[PDB]
Swiss-Prot record, chain B:
Changing R22Q: In MODY10; reduces binding affinity to INSR; reduces biological activity; reduces folding properties. This is Insulin B chain. Changing F24S: In HPRI; Los-Angeles. The gene is INS.
């Protein structure tokens, strides 16, 4: 999930926008 | 601000700034 992708590893804009409504 | 390790309040802040008026879901489990 988001923690594995953006906290344990380096985040991206691409991935953050997958969590916008 | 997005291209880094973001945890906790730092991750929620990035979601808030990117998603704007859409809002977002924060599902750490």
């Amino acid at each position: 999930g988001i923690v594995e992708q953006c906290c344990t590893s380096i985040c991206s804009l691409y991935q953050l926008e997958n969590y916008c409504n | 601000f997005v291209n880094q390790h973001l945890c906790g309040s730092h991750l929620v802040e990035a979601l808030y700034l990117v998603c704007g008026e859409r809002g977002f879901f924060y599902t750490p489990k």
